[PDB]
Paper text:
The mycobacterial HTH-transcriptional regulator (EthR) has been reported to be a facilitator for the resistance of the second-line tuberculosis drug, ethionamide. Studies of the resistance mechanism of ethionamide revealed that an increase in the expression of HTH-Transcriptional regulator, EthR, reduces transcription and the level of active EthA protein, and results in resistance by M. tuberculosis. The discovery of this transcriptional regulator led to the notion of controlling EthA expression levels by targeting EthR and thus boosting the bactericidal effect of ethionamide. EthR binding site is characterized by a long hydrophobic tunnel surrounded mostly by hydrophobic residues, many of which are aromatic, plus four polar amino acids and a basic residue.
We then managed to obtain X-ray crystal structures for compounds 1, 2, 3, 5, 6, 7, 10, and 12 bound to EthR. The EthR-compound 1 co-crystal structure confirms the occupancy of the compound in the EthR binding site. Compound 1 is active against both EthR (IC50 ≈12 μM) and InhA (62% inhibition at 100 μM), confirming the computational predictions. Interestingly, this compound was identified solely from structure-based predictions. Even though an attempt to obtain a co-crystal structure of the compound with InhA was unsuccessful, the docking LEI values for the compound to both enzymes (EthR: 1.58 and InhA: 1.11) indicate high binding affinity. Another common feature shared between several of the compounds (1, 2, 3, 7, and 10) is the presence of a ketone that forms a hydrogen bond with N176 in all but compound 3. Thiophenes and thioethers are present in compounds 1, 8, and 10 and are known to be substrates for EthA.
Author numbering:
A (entry chain A), B (entry chain A): 22 to 214
Amino acid sequence: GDDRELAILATAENLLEDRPLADISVDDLAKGAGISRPTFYFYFPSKEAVLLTLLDRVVNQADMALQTLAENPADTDRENMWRTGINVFFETFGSHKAVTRAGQAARATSVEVAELWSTFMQKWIAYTAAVIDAERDRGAAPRTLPAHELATALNLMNERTLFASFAGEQPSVPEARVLDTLVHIWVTSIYGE
Amino acid sequence: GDDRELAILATAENLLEDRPLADISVDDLAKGAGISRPTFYFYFPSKEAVLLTLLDRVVNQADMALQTLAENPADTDRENMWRTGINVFFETFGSHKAVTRAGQAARATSVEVAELWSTFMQKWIAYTAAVIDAERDRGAAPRTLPAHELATALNLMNERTLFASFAGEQPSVPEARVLDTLVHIWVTSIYGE
Ligand SMILES: O=C(NC1=NCCS1)c1sc2cc(F)ccc2c1Cl
Ligand SMILES: O=C(NC1=NCCS1)c1sc2cc(F)ccc2c1Cl
């Protein structure tokens, strides 16, 4: 039941490590999951729906980790607060590089993937802006740019920069340097006058 | 001769304002250019080659404008120096939103488009890093992050943020606010300690 669905998703995630979704057939997913092709269509309408499901799981994993941080503040300085938050995305998406890569590509062809990404980016930007606003209200950060616009640019920077690093794009920040790079830009732009 | 080639390119740029390249046929380009479909194939091997050419023109337009700034420094403060440079990309790509949008999408399917974008991003990042390094050498900027890694993240932020704004993506910075937003992040991250 749910056993076969998880097998399809595990097969898809593993095959995406080796080739794009365009190079994966429904028969590949069924064969790797130990089922027939008609049985596959009971669980998923298409291979694109499998990727949508995988991306939904990764994005909710990141969101739930951020929710955990929000409820459990780490007793540390302000730079470490931002670093621990950026690390949620570095670690979660960096642990699922193949699904991350395929998911971003699917944005151009799937309105469901595009809407899923848009929905969570809006949530993450709104939370970023709320934390910036809290830092301004306590007097720690200066009232410079509108917080929501600053939050938008910083979140888009992280999206583009993390995903370029994971994909080994030319140009990209080395994966071993990208966390420090992003933290620097966040902290200077949020606290700098 | 070159008259017909420019007509094909002008037709393509105008049709891209209304629908994606997938929805444009070679007959559409030929008809709008006043030629037959076989005559089109004399000038271009495919509609994708037309887009590649359009993107090449826009990217070189931006590069040449940046070269002009580099040779003709504006007598103004440091924040205005960075703003005038970011504006090259804001104005050049914002004046060709349809080609910009189609060109970024083609990166996923055209190795020639992907290599073209990669080549110029490497050039722009190297120049950004050289300007940061010059500011550090004269004592105006602190020696914080490696300049090339900082330059990479800032250039990727501008790519993602400008193109989201031009496309009216959800989420995005309003086009009327994006220049100020990016300038703030560049100046604070380059000069902040
Ligand atoms: O990194 C972010 N978003 C995205 N990265 C790549 C895909 S989108 C960050 S860091 C960070 C720190 C915080 F204290 C609060 C929120 C926050 C967020 Cl939201
Ligand atoms: O904006 C840039 N790059 C890209 N924007 C979107 C596509 S890529 C900027 S601003 C800027 C200022 C400078 F003084 C020197 C370089 C420079 C560059 Cl390079």
